[PDB]
Design a protein around this ligand. Sequence first.
Ligand code: GDP
Ligand code: GDP
Lengths: 165, 164
Amino acid sequence: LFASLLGEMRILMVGLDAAGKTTILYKLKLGEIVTTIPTIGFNVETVEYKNISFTVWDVGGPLWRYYFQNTQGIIFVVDSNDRDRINEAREELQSMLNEDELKDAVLLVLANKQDLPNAMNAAEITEKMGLHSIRNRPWFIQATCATTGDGLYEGLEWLSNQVGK
Amino acid sequence: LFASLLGRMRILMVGLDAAGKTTILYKLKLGEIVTTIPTIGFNVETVEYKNISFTVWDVGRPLWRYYFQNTQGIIFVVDSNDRDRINEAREELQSMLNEDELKDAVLLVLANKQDLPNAMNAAEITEKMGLHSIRNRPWFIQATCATTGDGLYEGLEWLSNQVG
Ligand SMILES: Nc1nc2c(ncn2[C@@H]2O[C@H](COP(=O)(O)OP(=O)(O)O)[C@@H](O)[C@H]2O)c(=O)[nH]1
Ligand SMILES: Nc1nc2c(ncn2[C@@H]2O[C@H](COP(=O)(O)OP(=O)(O)O)[C@@H](O)[C@H]2O)c(=O)[nH]1
C-alpha cells in the first residue's frame, strides 16, 4: 500500500492541464481531493495524509512562493502523447526549477499516459524536457499510466526515499 | 447570504468545461469541494451540507441515471462569453431535459461571466439555449458573475423556494 511507502511536508505536483495529475491524486488513496480557490483563477487540489500535503495546480502561460515554503519534492506530470505541448511543458519545468525557494526540493518527472500507442517513451521525454542538464538536484523520470496505476508507486518510492536521505 | 438560503437532497450543477461550476461551488461555502473519479474520464466535484448534495461534472453514460433518483433541481451553467460553443451547450441541456429520471427537477440557468464586455446577456442566452421551448417544467435564467458572486444569490433564492 502507498500509505506505508511514505512512512516531506509538501509535495508539489504540477504540469500542464489534462496531464493526469488529478487522476494520480485519486490513485494515491490517501484522502479526499479538496479543491480551493485561494485567489481568482488559481485552482488548487490538495490531499493531506497525516503530515504530508500534496498540492496540485495546472501550469501554463507570486503566491506560489508560499507553497514553495517547505516543499521538499516536485512531481512534474507530463502527457507523453501530447507532442504539441511538450515544449511548453519543458519551459514550465524550467520556470519552477529556477525558483530559489524550490532548489532544495527533489524532482520526480512522470512520463504519463504510456498506454497510448503514439506516446513518447520515458527516455524521449527525458531528452525533450532537458532533464540531463539538471545539477545540484536529484531527479528521476518514471514511465507511468495514471488511469491504471502502473509505475505510480516505484516513482513515488524513489521520491519518499529521496526526501528522507 | 448563501449558506442562509439552503438551511432548510441532490442538486445537479452541470455545464460545459470552464463555465464556472467549480467557481460557483466555492461561492456556496456549504463545505469542502471534493473531487472524485467514479470511472475513468468522469470527474465529479461534490459539496455536501448535511441534507444537500451539490454534484458537479462537465458535459459536452447510463451512470448519470443513479445520480438522478432524488435530484430536485438542476443548475445549467453556461459561459455567456463562449459564443463558439453556445450551441453545444444547448444540445447538452436538451439531452439533460429529455432524461426521464430528471423530469420533475426544476431548472436554474446561470448566464455566467457577465463581467466580460462581449458576453451574451440573459435575454439572448434564453433565446439560444431554448428555454421558452421548455414545457412540463419550471425553469429560470439568472445573469451571474461567479467571480464576484453577482447574481448567484438571486438565482439560488429561486432554487431555494422551488425545492425549499
Ligand atoms: N490514456 C491515459 N489517459 C490518462 C492517464 N492519466 C490521465 N488520463 C486522462 O487525462 C484526462 C485528464 O486527467 P486529469 O487527472 O484530470 O488531468 P489534470 O488536468 O492534470 O488533473 C482524463 O480524462 C484522464 O482519463 C493515463 O495514464 N493514460
Ligand atoms: N470573467 C469571468 N471568469 C470566470 C467566471 N466564472 C469563472 N471564471 C473563470 O473560468 C475559469 C474556470 O472556471 P471553473 O469554475 O473551473 O469552470 P468549470 O469547468 O465549470 O469548473 C476560472 O479560471 C475562472 O477564472 C465569471 O463569472 N467571469
